[PDB]
Structure 1
Amino acid sequence: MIAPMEKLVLAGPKGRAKELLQSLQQAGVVHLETLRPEALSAYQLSPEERA
């Protein structure tokens, strides 16, 4: 059958978001979504992080 596939939205500060990204990568049970448009930034992290 088709599953429910509930949507989840999370927010907070930046370093806690990096830790929660490590968490949700360890707990990889949620597919991602952009949702960039309404009053948000792009989260271009760092060129040092890019390096």
Structure 2
Amino acid sequence: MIAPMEKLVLAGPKGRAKELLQSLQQAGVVHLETLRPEALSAYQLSPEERA
């Protein structure tokens, strides 16, 4: 039996975004999604984080 595979939506601030993505990536049991077209930007990340 294939698992029912629920959806997980999160939000918040961006220093907390990097920190919660760290804490979500340490317990790595989640798949990702683009979530572009509605009401938000494509998130060009940062220049210093790109370096």
Q: Counterparts of 2:23 and 2:42 in 1: how far apart (Å)?
A: 21
Q: Give the Cα separation in 1 of the matches to 2:27 and 2:43.
A: 21
Unaligned runs of 5+ in 1: none
> What's 1:12 paired with?
12
Q: Distance in 2 between matches of 1:12 and 1:48?
A: 21
Structure 2: tracts of 5 or more residues without a match: none
For residues 6-51 of structure 1, what are the alpha-carbon distances to aligned partners after superposition, in whole Å with 9 as ceiling and x for unaligned? 1100001111111011011101111001111110112222121111
Task: Give the TM-score normalised by structure 1.
Answer: 0.88
> How many angstroms apart in 2 are the aligned matches of 1:27 and 1:42?
26
User: Under a length normalisation based on structure 2, what TM-score does the superposition of the two structures give?
Assistant: 0.88
In 1, the alpha carbon distance for the partners of 2:42 and 2:28 equals 22
Q: What is the CA RMSD across the aligned residues, in angstroms?
A: 0.9
Match of 2:25 in 1: 25
- Count of residue pairs the alignment pairs up: 51
Identity of aligned residues (%): 100
